[PDB]
């Protein structure tokens, strides 16, 4: 009867320690690798005036996305249970969730002071103008980042949401949905038990239901990103500007 008091188990504490560590090894908050990307271009080369080419940011953002896909894969491989899956199910899970985990994890650099993704310098501060008929995606995306930022997630909750996103048993092409669902159940119970035992009120009120709604919001952004991407990648001049990994994963 006192056995019903929620307590974070030892396995649940290992899952959190692993996901925290996996995210610390795959997300560099100093953004030092961004210097390896093709440079961002916002000003005209002739650099006190803006560049008017609407794809001038494409080389830079394509390299940023491609790099982030690599980090998402590195993080997913450390999700407890992800490696028990067949290589086909892993590929299906990453192909489906890659752009959603990227948008989740970007919230670390998103700031509500000016509604931009700020990665340590003005070279790597991205606002709406950079990401710019892409407003069909960007306005929802920003509304999403604001809503997520306002949840004020602990880092423990943040990595758990990323792992729950990747291991979704309802993704198209999943073969062994029972195994995927069992892996996600272990993560869901960890997060729910974490909030109840570690997240103080009032911020913890209805927090788990709100987080699951962000997973629901991401599906809609995924579809929206899919439409933009297929129209962009169709023009060979624009797909020349992509990377092989992005073409394989998003194609």
């Amino acid at each position: 009867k006192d056995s019903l008091r929620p307590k974070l188990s030892e396995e649940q504490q290992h899952i959190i320690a692993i996901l925290l560590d996996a995210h610390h090894k795959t997300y560099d908050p100093t953004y030092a690798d961004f210097r390896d990307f093709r440079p961002p271009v916002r000003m005209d080369g002739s650099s006190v005036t803006l560049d008017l080419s609407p794809l001038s940011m494409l080389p830079h953002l394509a390299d940023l996305v491609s790099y982030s896909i690599q980090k998402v894969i590195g993080f997913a491989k450390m999700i407890p249970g992800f490696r028990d899956l067949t290589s086909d199910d892993q590929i299906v899970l990453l192909k489906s969730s890659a752009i959603e985990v990227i948008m989740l994890r970007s919230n670390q650099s998103f700031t509500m002071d000016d509604m931009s993704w700020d990665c340590g310098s003005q070279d790597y501060k991205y606002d709406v103008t950079d990401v710019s008929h892409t407003l069909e995606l960007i306005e929802p995306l920003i509304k999403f980042q604001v809503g997520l930022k306002k949840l004020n997630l602990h880092e423990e909750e943040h990595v758990l949401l990323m792992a729950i996103c990747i291991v979704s048993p309802d993704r198209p092409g999943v073969q062994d949905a029972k195994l995927v669902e069992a892996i996600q159940d272990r993560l869901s119970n960890t997060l729910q038990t974490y909030i109840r035992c570690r997240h103080p009120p009032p911020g913890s009120h209805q927090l788990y239901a709100k987080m699951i709604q962000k997973l629901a919001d991401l599906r809609s952004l995924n579809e929206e990103h899919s439409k933009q991407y297929r129209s962009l990648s169709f023009q060979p001049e624009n797909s020349m500007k992509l990377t092989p990994l992005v073409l394989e994963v998003f194609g």
Binding site: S87, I91, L94, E248, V249
Partner: peptide, 10 residues
Amino acid sequence: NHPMLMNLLK
């Protein structure tokens, strides 16, 4: 037909 993504999971 996902050789790079497959290589990254190894």
